[PDB]
Design a protein around this nucleic acid. Structure first.
Lengths: 236, 236
DNA sequence: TTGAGGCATTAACATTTGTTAACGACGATA
DNA sequence: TATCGTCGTTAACAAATGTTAATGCCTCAA
């Protein structure tokens, strides 16, 4: 992205060099809260939370370049206890101390607006996602989450639209929609397989009826159209 | 509170004076989408969306002072098609044109951080709310929404904690949690009535077991502690 | 006093989802 | 080769939620 490359060179002009992480590694976590401004430049990650009773929740995925704040900018305190796990093989991110960030954005306003814009993309995204997961229950939550992955990690193929995401087990989908048991997620997939909506070929998901998912996630599709028009046009 | 007064006097220097609205009135809407930056100064509102088949969704409430973005700052387009209905008798809000906002925040950087902070409070709120409504289904969604209302509109009294909302029908709670039929909301409330969690006096809600709701909304309670510590202290 | 309409409660059914378990396929280690 | 572990189906059962309808309470309007 053009605005992220200029934000890279800027952070590298002020001595904020990149750090490397590998799969399964946590940039920040929920137990040792440290207020950071993560600038995920390259890689794929998921924001998770583990309750006291052990249940895992997959709140959302993040694909670079994007910005994830674990602390506020004025109070410099925590926004919440979450984990940011790397799920791609390797991921590069610039870890910025919350205090210095405040100083970098006051210098240059083009990068202030950039971090502000990406923050607006976060707000609209959560509202849309919250809207679609609530109306139609779990079937809609699985359909809605699949629609997200299809736009971001989808590539057209002979057999539909291939989701280029490894280790997307049944447990990982259930975590995204609040389903605790893999058998429940599976039962829903067997209904979508029978309805010719998707095919689970080779431990990879193929989408053949994009319109059906658009039915159950109208606001999320509306969001990709409005907020990520390039990613949306590639499938329309 | 205090930082909003400085944002008031500031807005009262660049000729962007406040407009007054009454109950049932829509500041912005989904069908005629104008891009504005709302600075709700005083009053109560709800952000809604109406599907194509008429179903209503209540995404969240807003009590001044707060900021609601209906459009992006860089692209100057809409963040999504939503309605912002006034539910209090009278509400005062400063309507800012989206094209003017970018120049106004560059003048004073302390008010830039203010609008930036309130957006981080929006992001954290949506993640927490999304987290708690997903784990335990609809019972948890009603409990979580109730926990929200209890902190923002709750006042301790001899019997229970009064949720001071004039119109809080069964149908309006279902809209907040994705329940389409009021009879389903009632059945859930009848379970909470029998379990000594809440009572129903004068079409008004009273909470007697706040801890029971915290079980079903751990992230939302965590959020009030971190983001609205004053509102949290009033009940702890 | 009469009658209409909104709202809450309850019921009874249909559908979905939570929960536990058995079967069978695949990969890995020795 | 044999055998353990993980993950995906499918089943059966329990529990929650969707859906519709009848009922009773209340305010309003004439």
């Amino acid at each position: 992205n053009a605005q992220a490359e200029e934000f890279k060179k800027y952070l590298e002009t002020n001595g904020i060099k990149p750090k490397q992480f590998h799969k399964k590694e946590l940039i920040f976590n929920q137990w040792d809260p440290q207020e950071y401004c993560i600038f995920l430049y390259d890689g794929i990650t998921k924001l998770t939370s583990i309750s006291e009773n052990g249940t895992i929740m997959n709140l959302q995925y993040y694909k670079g370049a994007f910005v994830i704040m674990s602390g506020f900018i004025d109070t410099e305190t925590s926004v919440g206890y979450y984990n940011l796990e790397v799920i791609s093989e390797q991921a590069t991110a610039y870890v910025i101390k919350i205090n210095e960030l405040k100083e970098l954005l006051s210098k240059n306003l083009t990068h202030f607006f950039y971090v502000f814009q990406t923050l607006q993309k976060q707000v609209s995204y959560s509202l849309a996602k919250f809207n679609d997961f609530s109306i139609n229950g779990k079937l809609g939550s699985i359909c809605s989450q699949l629609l997200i992955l299809t736009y971001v990690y989808g590539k057209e193929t002979p057999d539909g639209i291939k989701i280029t995401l490894d280790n997307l087990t049944m447990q990982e989908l259930g975590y995204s929609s609040g389903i605790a048991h893999s058998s429940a997620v599976s039962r829903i997939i067997s209904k979508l397989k029978q309805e010719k909506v998707i095919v689970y070929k080779n431990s990879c998901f193929y989408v053949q009826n994009l319109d059906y998912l658009k039915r159950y996630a109208p606001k999320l599709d509306e969001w990709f159209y409005l907020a990520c028009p390039a990613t949306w046009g590639k499938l329309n």
